[PDB]
Design a protein around this ligand. Structure first.
Ligand SMILES: CS(=O)(=O)c1ccc(-c2nnc(/C=C/c3nnc(-c4ccc(C#N)cc4)o3)n2-c2ccccc2Cl)nc1
Ligand SMILES: NC(=O)c1cccnc1
Ligand SMILES: [Zn+2]
Length: 227
């Protein structure tokens, strides 16, 4: 596509203030995000042990997260990374899943709530594939599942993902485990690459919460296959 759907300028809400904007399914912005959500689903190695067993989702809502402070903090970081990387910010849309969605869209991503015991250390993790971020909606490795039924493969409870503007800058390409506290020298993010005897699907790690904007809030639920 050659239309500017994902990377439009944000305008002053008022603001306090996180305001959600309801996108109608007839809008091409809704449809693009929906299709990106649906088409990037892969068959996982766990057998769906973490994210659940599915092929597609039931997209219920796609809202656009509008926050003045979070925006004028992302742009400042983006401009900074750009200047340190030959005017190339390396911005792209990536999925994100965590139990902290409500906090992320009100306060922004927060590195100080990282993990350090992750594959690439104390960073905030993003994915090309929507079904990968889905494995982290109810916590690391799926956690105990949905709060109501304790089911990691629940088709009843509604879930939320984030489709985010991510500034990658000069990304450090890694195959093996490399537990970082910050982005490696000269770089601004880490890219986990697919490889045999390693990762099956890619992943992208930043170490500054200001380096990502939670543009799209997706309310969905995984769908039972037939059968
Ligand atoms: C299993 S793994 O691949 O290594 C892996 C590791 C880490 C992540 C990963 N990537 N991003 C996050 C969380 C980001 C975040 N931003 N703000 C918050 C927050 C805000 C307020 C409060 C309060 N009160 C708590 C948190 O969180 N996480 C994460 C961190 C700890 C626990 C679970 C997860 Cl998903 N994703 C995957
Ligand atoms: N929490 C996530 O969305 C995520 C994305 C990629 C890898 N690990 C976790
Ligand atoms: Zn449930």
């Amino acid at each position: 596509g050659t239309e500017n759907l994902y990377f439009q300028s944000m305008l002053n809400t008022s603001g306090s203030g996180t305001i959600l904007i309801d996108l109608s399914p007839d809008d091409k912005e809704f449809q693009s995000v929906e299709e990106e959500m649906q088409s990037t689903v892969r068959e996982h190695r766990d057998g769906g042990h973490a994210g659940g067993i599915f092929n597609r989702y039931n997209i219920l809502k796609i809202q656009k997260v509008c926050n003045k402070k979070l925006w004028e903090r992302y742009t400042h970081r983006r401009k900074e990374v750009s200047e340190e990387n030959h005017n190339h910010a390396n911005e792209r849309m990536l999925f994100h899943g965590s139990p902290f969605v409500n906090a992320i869209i009100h306060k922004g991503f927060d590195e100080r709530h990282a993990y350090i015991g992750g594959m690439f250390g104390a960073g905030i993790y993003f994915a090309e594939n929507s079904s990968k971020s889905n494995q982290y909606v109810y916590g690391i490795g799926g956690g105990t599942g949905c709060p109501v039924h304790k089911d990691r493969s629940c088709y009843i409870c509604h879930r939320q993902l984030l489709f985010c503007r991510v500034t990658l800058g000069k990304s450090f390409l890694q195959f093996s485990a490399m537990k970082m506290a910050h982005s490696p020298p000269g770089h601004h993010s880490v890219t986990g690459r697919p490889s045999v005897n390693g990762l099956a699907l890619a992943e992208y790690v930043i170490y500054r919460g200001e380096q990502a904007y939670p543009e799209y809030l997706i309310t969905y639920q995984i769908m039972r296959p037939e059968g």
